[PDB]
């Protein structure tokens, strides 16, 4: 007895079982199930994850809202033509507490996994679960938190998961600042200083025709031009986060403390 | 990829078996997984036979020696019995295909994996759960079949499925045992005449405790230990009485008795359902 699903309206489900049944029922009848996993507090970035998912012909869009340890968000999705919001409780995602989890590979130890050693294990575990519950054809992440997205690609390859992982370019303020829920915490000076991350990164990207060293130095110069910006790391890696090849396509990642607030950004880089 | 119905189809590439699996499924067939490490015996034939009796089922036996958790490797004998029981899919991946990037993303079992068999082998179950998961993801069966010999393993798998929300049913199958009670095992070939004989004491001891249990837990345990002690060259690694789910939950009326012993080199496991009272 398949749960009630009204096509073209916004259907909300809090029971995993329900969303799993609705979702399985929709695949069987043509629809391609797109998942956009969020933690609520939805901003334009999210919206651009949703929009991409709808571009896929015949798709139905699942947006989970789960706080991984408000009707305004439901309003945005309804106003976006989202047909499913999956809104489970913590006891429902975790009816037996933390038991079996995912152990990410060694890349979880670096970069962000320095300041936060266990964070990614948590991310990968909830992502596997959501992928299992919803079983989408495709799953949509912003490129902002880039390390996270790569580990997710590693989760999918490593466990032979059947989903396609789509990374959507990061949505930014007018001045380049990568969108983030933390942005509303920076006072004006900090907010104005924050502009340096993306400006460092864009500078690097364009400086890159002169090669690897000039990209890093361009970005480091820009970072240096800003007060109150404590850079935890600034690193050029290959697209999958191993060492940067002598020439080819890579990624440049930055992370920084503006007061209490930790900011991240990253960009694509071609060397030559 | 080709699928000849009513015969045995042997696929090497995960992709090959995932496509055929999915294809058969949409056309209404129900997919049954029997995960083996090969060297098939009468217990494996039971797993298959249970799988077969699920209506409109197609049966996939996987044969993979997962180097993450020495072993007898006998595919001709293995595949011969398979078409005899009328199995339609054998999945036989290479290590290359299963682990192209090596050990990377893995499964971390809960605390039950550090107990019992996990104490001296603390990365053993992570290996088991990892490859089981890979195998459920490759083949996407409706049900999956395990014998009950390796009981902790079964419970842990029930956990993998619950905690990761895998939509598959775990079917446990009663241990198939030799005429004298000895639990079927690939490790049995490794017992000489003296040891084969002594080995009967494991199943002997458990069935004695099943029956002494009317007198309580302490009597079931004492019974079972007495039989183990009266046995020549049987060194008991552990004998424990637990909840059926084996977990941080006390014993009440029903439970599970588990034993691990060594016959020289060869380590044996057995376990039994137990009712206290009853
Ligand atoms: C494509 O444009 C963007 C730009 C930034 C984005 C996003 C999209 C999406 C996010 C985001 O979802 N951040 S988050 O803290 O809500 C979040 C939500 C869900 C996860 C998991 C557990 C599903 C991986 C991680 C982070 N964020 C960062 C943020 O909103 O804090
Ligand atoms: C219902 O009858 C029985 C009785 C005993 C059984 C079995 C069935 C199955 C096994 C068994 O261990 N088979 S296995 O060694 O090939 C095997 C296969 C696959 C796993 C994984 C994939 C779950 C890790 C473990 C063991 N065994 C025990 C054994 O062969 O040692």
Numbering used by the authors:
A (entry chain B): 2 to 70, 86 to 288
B (entry chain A): 4 to 72, 81 to 289
Passage from the reporting paper:
Based on these observations, the initial optimization strategy was focused on replacement of the methyl pyridine and the benzofuran groups rather than the acyl sulfonamide linker in both compounds 5 and 8. Compounds were designed with the objective of optimizing interactions at the P1 or P2 sites of panthothenate synthetase.
Herein, we describe the use of GE to optimize a fragment‐derived inhibitor of Mycobacterium tuberculosis pantothenate synthetase, an attractive target for developing new drugs against tuberculosis. The work presented here demonstrates the use of GE analysis to critically and thoroughly examine the binding distribution of a lead compound and illustrates the practicality of applying GE analysis to modify parts of a molecule that are not making efficient contributions to binding. In this case, it led to the generation of a relatively potent and bactericidal inhibitor of M. tuberculosis pantothenate synthetase.
